[PDB]
Amino acid sequence: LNMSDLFELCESYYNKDDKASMIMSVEIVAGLVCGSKFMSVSDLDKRDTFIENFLAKCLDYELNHDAFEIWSTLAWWLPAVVDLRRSKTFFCHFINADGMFDRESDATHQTSKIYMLRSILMSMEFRAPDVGKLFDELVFDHPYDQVRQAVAKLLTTLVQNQSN
Amino acid sequence: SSINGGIVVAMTGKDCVAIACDLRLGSQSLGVSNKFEKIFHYGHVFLGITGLATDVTTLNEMFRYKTNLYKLKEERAIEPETFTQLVSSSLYERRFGPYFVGPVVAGINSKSGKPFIAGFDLIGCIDEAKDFIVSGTASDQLFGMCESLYEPNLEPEDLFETISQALLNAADRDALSGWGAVVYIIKKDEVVKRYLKMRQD
C-alpha cells in the first residue's frame, strides 16, 4: 500500500449524515496519529499535511452536533494514549483557532472549539505546551451564556495546570 | 313489518340446495329500489331475511361480525346447524324486543355433505323441513306453489327451474314483491347466482 489509501478511506468515510461513518473516519485519524512511531520523515510530513487539511476542512465551517461529540471524545482520548508532539499540525489547529474568543461573532461553534481545546489541555495538565497567550486572549464580556461558561471552565483548567 | 315487502324461498335437492329471493324495496305502495338483495353468505352458509329492511341490514352486519369472530377464535368455518342455533339464540335474546324479521338458513355441511335448510319465526323458533322453507309477505302463495310443484331428489338443473317458477308465480300475485329475482344454486364446491327476467320491471 502506497500510504495514501488510508487518506482516501478517511476522506470517503467522513459523511456528515451517518454518525457511524464519521466515527470510523475519526478512528482512522486516531490510528494515523497513534501510528507515528514506525514511519519515516517524509511519511510524517505527509501525515502532518493531511491532518492539517482534514482538520481545516472538518472543524472550521459548521458542526451538526453529531461530529462534535466524536471530535470531543477524540480530543479527550488521543492525548492520553500518545504524545501530541509527534504531530506538528494536530495541536496547532486547536491552539491557533481563529475567532474562538471573538466577542461580536454571532457562539455554538466558538463554544465547541473552546471545549475541544479545554479537553486537550485537561488530558495533559502539567506536561502541556506553553499556552499562556490564552491568558491575553480570554474574553469576559461575551454576551452569550454558553461562551461565558466555556471561558470560565477554560480559565479553571489553565489555573489548575499551573499549580503543580 | 310488512311495509317494505320481499319474499325468500329455499328448497333442498339432490346433494344441492337452492335459495331465491325477490329484489323489491319500497315504502308501502311506492317502489324505491329494484336492487335490494336479501340473501347473504358467511363462509359457506347462506341466510335470507325478510321483513323490515333496517333490521335485515342490522342482522346481516351482526351475523357477519359474529361469524368472523367465530372463524378467528375456532380456526374453522361455522356449519349450517351451529349457525342456525346461533341465530335462534340471538333472536331469543331480544324477547319482548324482537327484530321484525323472518330468517331462512340454507347450506351444505362441509363434513357430512348433506343439505340443510331451516326457517325462523319472530323470536327464533327453529323450523327444520326436509322439503322447503318460505318467508315473506307472499308466504301463502309460496306454500301453495311449493306444495304443488316440489319433488324430492331433484337435480340442480330441475331444482333451479322449480324454485324459479315457484318464486315468480308467487311474486306475481303479491303487490309488495316482484321487481326482479335472484336464485342461488349451491353445491358441494360450486355456487351459481342467476338473475331472472320478470314483469313490472
Binding site: - | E61, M62, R64, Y65, N68, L69, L72, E75
Partner: protein, 228 residues
C-alpha cells in the same frame, strides 16, 4: 424520568424468540423461531407466534403468551367493530395505534403490570399499500422496511441492513429472512419444526389473499430450495 417496569419488560422480551418482518415492493414476509422443546410437547398449538387479526392484517409476537392472547383478542374485536361501523376494513395504522394506546395506558396506571410483549404488524390497505410496524411495551409504534425483535435483535438488524434492497421481491424477502435467522440462532442449524412463516401478498387479480400461513411441509420445501 426512566420507567423501570418498561425496562424490565424490554429485558424480558430480549430473552424471547426472534421474529423478523421484511417488506417488499409487492408483499410482506413474517418469520418466527420456535424455542421451546421437550420431546413430548405438542407442536400443533395452532400458530404459536403468528396470529391473524383479520383477512388483511397479521401479527408476530415476542414475549409472554397470555398478554399476547389478550391483546390479539382485543385487536380482533376492534377490527370487527370498525368493519361493522364503516362497512370497510380497518386501516393498519389505526389498529396499531389502538394497541399502542392500550399498552401506554397499561404503563401509566398503578396496579397493572406492563405488557411484556413486542408486536410486529404486517398489513395491507388501499391508502398506503403494504405496511410494516413494530410496537413495544412503552406504547410507541414505528414503521419499518425490515425489522427484527426478540433475542438477537442487533445482529439481525445488522444482517438486514447489509443485504436489503428497496425493490426486492417476495421470494427475495423470504430468502433474506431465512438466511438472517439461520445466521443468528444459537441452535447450530435451522429446522422446519422450529420455524413459523407467513406471507401477505397481492396477485395480478385483485383478490388480496392475505392469509397464507405456511404449513410445516411448505416450510421444509422452502428451506430445501433456499439451501439452509
Amino acid at each position: 424520568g426512566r420507567l423501570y417496569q418498561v425496562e424490565y419488560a424490554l429485558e424480558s422480551i430480549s430473552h424471547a424468540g426472534t421474529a423478523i418482518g421484511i417488506m417488499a415492493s409487492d408483499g410482506i414476509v413474517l418469520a418466527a423461531e420456535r424455542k421451546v422443546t421437550s420431546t413430548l410437547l405438542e407442536q400443533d398449538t395452532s400458530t404459536e407466534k403468528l396470529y391473524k387479526l383479520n383477512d388483511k392484517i397479521a401479527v408476530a409476537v415476542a414475549g409472554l403468551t397470555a398478554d399476547a392472547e389478550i391483546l390479539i383478542n382485543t385487536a380482533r374485536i376492534h377490527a370487527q367493530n370498525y368493519l361493522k361501523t364503516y362497512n370497510e376494513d380497518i386501516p393498519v395504522e389505526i389498529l396499531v395505534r389502538r394497541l399502542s394506546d392500550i399498552k401506554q395506558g397499561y404503563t401509566q396506571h398503578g396496579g397493572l403490570r406492563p405488557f411484556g410483549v413486542s408486536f410486529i404488524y404486517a398489513g395491507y390497505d388501499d391508502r398506503y399499500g403494504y405496511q410494516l410496524y413494530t410496537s413495544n411495551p412503552s406504547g410507541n409504534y414505528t414503521g419499518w422496511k425490515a425489522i427484527s425483535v426478540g433475542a438477537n435483535t442487533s445482529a439481525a438488524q445488522t444482517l438486514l441492513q447489509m443485504d436489503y434492497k428497496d425493490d426486492m421481491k417476495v421470494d427475495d424477502a423470504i430468502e433474506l429472512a431465512l438466511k438472517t435467522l439461520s445466521k443468528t440462532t444459537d441452535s447450530s442449524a435451522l429446522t422446519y419444526d422450529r420455524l413459523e412463516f407467513a406471507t401477505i401478498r397481492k396477485g395480478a387479480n385483485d383478490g388480496e389473499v392475505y392469509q397464507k400461513i405456511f404449513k410445516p411441509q411448505e416450510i421444509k420445501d422452502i428451506l430445501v430450495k433456499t439451501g439452509i
